[PDB]
Backbone:
């Protein structure tokens, strides 16, 4: 083999959130080291229930990696999946596999002395970014307006507003208020978080049309593909969805329905970089736009490798976990130039680790 | 509410197999009790990796059941799924949910003093059954021949032979040998266990055509829907598949492709009775036949409720876990008449339990 | 068996209407009792011609229920259908079967000490409701306006206005008048009762778009599925139809055409709860909304069991037939908590019964 | 940038064939070197007219590579294509681009100290191989028989026989003769080289069915997708095609028609490794088998990276151009383990070079 | 044969542009003469990279024309294509073939003493024309406004404006300015040159709707057929595309998608008149409009032969190459009446020729 895995360590780290949304996020870290002295770091996560399950499964299948050639990433993804075949090809088991998968990609990239973006091959050195500016449905427009202004001032390229509350007139007012404040030149998008039924989504999308939003995210249930397809066919405003999906197959179904103008795959959630690339390949062929969701630390690299100009969300919740940081400038997020994912665990991770296990002999 | 859940207990029981094939099966038991004194028992399982993950997730979401009306089964399935939304609608998380789901159905049936089959409404009091007679690819033909003949004399209604070895001539020989021994009056089916590629499956199905087998099971990868549909369109022999799928959505895709003459949903594997019923409704409408896989203790009830004559496999591995037994006669297994699933945990379960947890106050 | 039917009584009851619409409605009541002392009550109906036919058929097939296990509801639906096979799977014969079907469901629910909603499993304890406030095309807007206001005051959650008269400008005026009176906050829907041809429906739907109605009901002939599908594709306003259909097959065709945003199945009209559930399963899978038509006494239970928020019409014409009543509060209809359908025949039913028959020996 | 391209050299080398079939093959070699001291070698080719055109275009666009980051392979493929946009996305211009593309991949692999197969990630360390044993339509049966048997004793895993001559009876005779000589255990395939019209292909495939050939290659015109799809739907024997196609788009069309059981993309012919990977992704998703055509020195690496067991032709014509060799044993060719493609130009290349050019300053 | 080719001369002529756009255009001229004394002139071209490749290939395959019957044009197109089969059916090789193809058509037309338009059969003696009036995105509206006015004054029938710059508000302003200047009676069209992504194209097309433009050209990537089809389905304004395509197959795909209201095939770019006619036949059958791109000297003849009123661009860049000129009158371009294409090489061609070759003996 090109090398061989000799040690693996998994940790279940509970990241406390500065502000309740959801008071914490369970992060599954996977560390892999080889006889050749190469090392990789990867992770998966669970918002709400899922952390314990991901860790337990990861611990059970980890031994299957020992002795294997780390360069055969897809092959190993398949081997770990087969090791837990009755668990399926999506959900907790493949998310656990994803932590290992990301680590192997990190390791291969470092082996070449290249950032993950350069190993895959990039199309740009910076990616369009946007943020919520710490805005929620319960955030007084006044505060959200001043926070969004600050974000723009520090380099954010767009603002995503939370909508989808029983009183639709409220959202329209809030959005109207933000648009008047920032100006027509600031890109604006909304996220309904699956709060609308088909009739309501139909009416709200109609109202938002004049706003020229970048996109309307998750207007319906994440699984209502025909519903999303119907909205995309009817309205000029792009429809964005997919962040809730957990496998290449689900994204394939969404794509088959032409249910999204902007596909929002979540690498950790779908099983890692390996399945994410298969999804990106399908989206590319279908001529769609890409807007990866969550984990910017990983997605900035994946987005950089997509043919068409993508959008990545500037999200700072995971920063305390790492020693590195992402920098933003003139509406764009810079793609890190360091080898691999360019991440190392902060000293704070230890204090937040509730479970851990390892197998093999460390080099 | 009709009632209120007050106590829940989950157990991870490792069933040792008298004959390695894999030397054990992880069973997740869920016990539910209410303020009204009602009780239910359900379970899910994992062959190979999966047991630890299912238990861990079940333990984390169990508290969400306390205080809820046990009669709103589908509603609670959704609540538990939402409680772990980032985990998706299939795989380990929904299988954990399935243990609770089965228990709720068991409890509702008992509440009406009806077997699960009668609660759902049955079409028959006994179901066609078949077995492998402890035969595997490595079992010497002559042994499998006397074993099969023995199963027939005990009342089994059919024999499923394992095939799919590199030397197709061998399988053809073994099947020919079995057919000549038992006679043309004994129903025969084969299981290739996803071992054939499209070209090989094409040639083997061609050869088996004259045999008039009941079905050819899993000739291709469980996810090659187009491949299976092509075989079903070409050959007279029914194609059976679906045992590997873990969600209603995956079965829906298989059904959309018309990839199976006999659909083989596995209740515990797809998330319980609730999603299984949705799958059965889709199969019924599509005019397909049903042959549920594994867990006869549960599937005999579900099969009894299907409009068209189904087939259920009679296999003994799980018996040690329960105090009750399935009866077979004249080629069919009798649908139990006791309330609910008609199962209670044996004293052996305790000794095989490696993990357990409970929440709430037992009535 | 779980039990066995020993007595059956059918009655043809003619319900006189307080105000001509249609001066009466023929109701077919079915009573079923078992050796175990269990009892069930169900019914079907005919607006205009149909009462005599339903009763005659019910009387002829009733004997087929004696001795049968009441828990095998679907099986018995099929047996009664086969008993009159040349009559088909829809229309008068299956509507007669439906009376028996509803009774069997009522009996099974009572057996478990659960309301019908809880036996099926509910998603809500109350359902959105609406009414016409005794409004017809010939009702002076002035009166309809004050009546609608009263309905809202007593808890009704929406108002359905009758439209579809030769003078379209009239309907627009009437609707404009009602909207201005009640305010934009009161949900409003219209019912054209199949009075428009494709061109007219096209023009009227266009005009109603700004109104933001909950739905436009039966704009075209109940059987013009392509016509309805075209309207739904073109307009934001939901299209509602299906109330005239009499079988799962017809609803399946409507669904295949994507001819309705809100499907309006009528349990009694399609053959009872058994076929209604098959229809609801198809609508659920297609991602549609549900708005059962007529018989709120039965549909409130069925609606409660649907995944997505349905709408049920508050209709008081059938009240004199029963001793129980439905209560409405804050725009919602409360789902009864009593066992089964929660209905018993009033003493007035006897005086209105024109035909009756029974078979078997009462327990 | 990760690095920077500083020098590029292109050579048009005419490979003389020891045996006319066409007496030579024009090979376009591309050498790329960077400021960081990294180097890559790639190539494209033309059988018959094409060599001069490929070189001329390569020379004209080569300057566009100077100063660029060699790691952004896909990006540069697009830049060179845009540099000659009026030339399209297929044919001579993209084949010229492919020589550079292969060199960039070779360079990236070497950068990581990995073979091309390991950089991409492999599923196997050896690939099934087959050869023609120097047999053509004019080769006397008995000679081809001893030649084939010889290839088998040296380790070849299969024999491809050339067919498609006006006298079909002859082919059938020759194939029958070969089959009887080698035995039923030696895999056999035939290549009709687009010689049959639909009617003839239909009859010949019918006759070959009993033979159980691995595949029937190019039975019809390379562009008759409907024709090929019809044959594949009708016959058990796999249909193989695609070797003549020159772009991802053409392969996509073939795949859309389901016109091939075995897709035969030719990396150099379609524009290099970059477009080849896109084609492989499409074939993988469609559930097809892979059998890359020509250039085993390159395809052995690409085939190793495909999920399902592929077939690669072992043919010796290009060996004189390189200092390295492919090893075969037990019916499979070993995937080279050296860095990158594992190829270096032999001293003979210089003598066969008719044209060459370079740009930039060599490090 | 009807005659036989005895001499062929190819020249690579670099046409310098009066103003940078692109400072020159490579033109490939092909001259063919027969034993019968007949002669033909044709050409192909490359904007940016492509000239050297086209010439090199043309030189290599030219010998294949000697001795052949010039009247069998399609047959010879196929023979030359086969002569370079590994080069494919599009791109540089077929463009080289196209130069010869045009010459053969010119020769056949002259043989009959008919213009090319009359040989094919025409529907009109003049064709609607339009121009850019030397306008580019960087041209100050003031100048573009006065230039467009002059064009109209000298007989041009329409104005095409360049759009597709980052600042969409700019294009709208420029177009608004031009429309106000020339008046609503002057046909206006825009060309976005593939500068918009789907979302942007969607928004810009919406804005342009009120303008009643003749068409919106290349709003998206030339290969995004689904994208173009979606725009055409949604908007009243015709979508025009196809100028970038290089083969009948690509145009066929575009047509299959109903991706264009106005198809813009480029004869030289797709391989000559032979493939252009196949494309025109497909467009005619699909009921589309035709707007050939570039080379008016050739397209005026081809456009004249199309059933529906086409549009041809008045483009003067190629004039210096020929001794003849096209005349425009009352918004239409007159179809030349001279034999064949009606073109002869100017004395300036010699000075601009960088490469040339000939084969055979001149008559
Ligand atoms: Ca859209
Ligand atoms: Ca079949
Ligand atoms: Ca609609
Ligand atoms: Ca086939
Ligand atoms: Ca249009």
Residues:
């Amino acid at each position: 083999p090109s090398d061989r895995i000799t040690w693996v360590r998994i940790s279940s780290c509970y990241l406390p959130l500065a502000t309740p949304i959801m008071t914490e996020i369970a992060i599954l870290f996977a560390e892999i080291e080889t006889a050749g002295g190469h090392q990789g770091l990867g992770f998966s996560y669970s918002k709400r229930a899922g952390g314990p399950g991901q860790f337990a499964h990861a611990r059970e299948i980890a031994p299957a990696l020992i002795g294997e050639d780390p360069s055969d990433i897809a092959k190993l993804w398949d081997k770990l999946c087969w090791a837990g075949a009755s668990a399926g090809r999506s959900g907790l088991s493949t998310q656990a596999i994803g932590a290992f998968d990301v680590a192997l990609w990190d390791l291969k990239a470092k082996r070449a002395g290249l950032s993950l973006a350069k190993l895959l091959g990039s199309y740009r050195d910076s990616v369009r970014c946007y943020n919520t500016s710490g805005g929620f449905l319960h955030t007084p427009i006044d505060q959200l307006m001043v926070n969004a202004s600050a974000s723009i001032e520090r380099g954010i390229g767009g603002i995503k507003l939370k909508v989808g509350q029983p009183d639709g007139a409220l959202d329209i007012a809030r959005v109207t208020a933000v648009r008047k404040h920032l100006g027509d030149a600031v890109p604006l998008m909304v996220d309904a978080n699956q709060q609308w039924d088909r009739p309501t989504a139909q009416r709200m999308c109609r109202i938002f049309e004049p706003f020229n939003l970048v996109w309307i995210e998750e207007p319906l249930d994440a699984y209502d593909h025909e519903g999303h397809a119907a909205l995309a066919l009817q309205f000029d405003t792009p429809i964005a969805t997919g962040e809730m999906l957990t496998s290449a197959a689900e994204h394939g179904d969404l794509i088959r329905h032409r249910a999204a103008d902007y596909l929002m795959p979540d690498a950790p959630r779908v099983g890692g970089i390996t399945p994410f690339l298969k999804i990106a390949s399908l989206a590319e062929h279908a001529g769609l736009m890409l807007a990866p969701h969550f984990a910017m630390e990983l997605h900035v690299h994946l987005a950089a490798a997509y043919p068409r100009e993508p959008w990545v969300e500037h999200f700072e919740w995971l920063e305390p976990l790492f020693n590195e940081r992402i920098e933003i400038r003139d509406g764009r997020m810079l793609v890190p130039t360091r080898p691999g994912l360019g991440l190392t665990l902060s000293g704070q991770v230890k204090a937040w680790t509730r479970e851990e296990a390892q197998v093999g002999t460390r080099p």
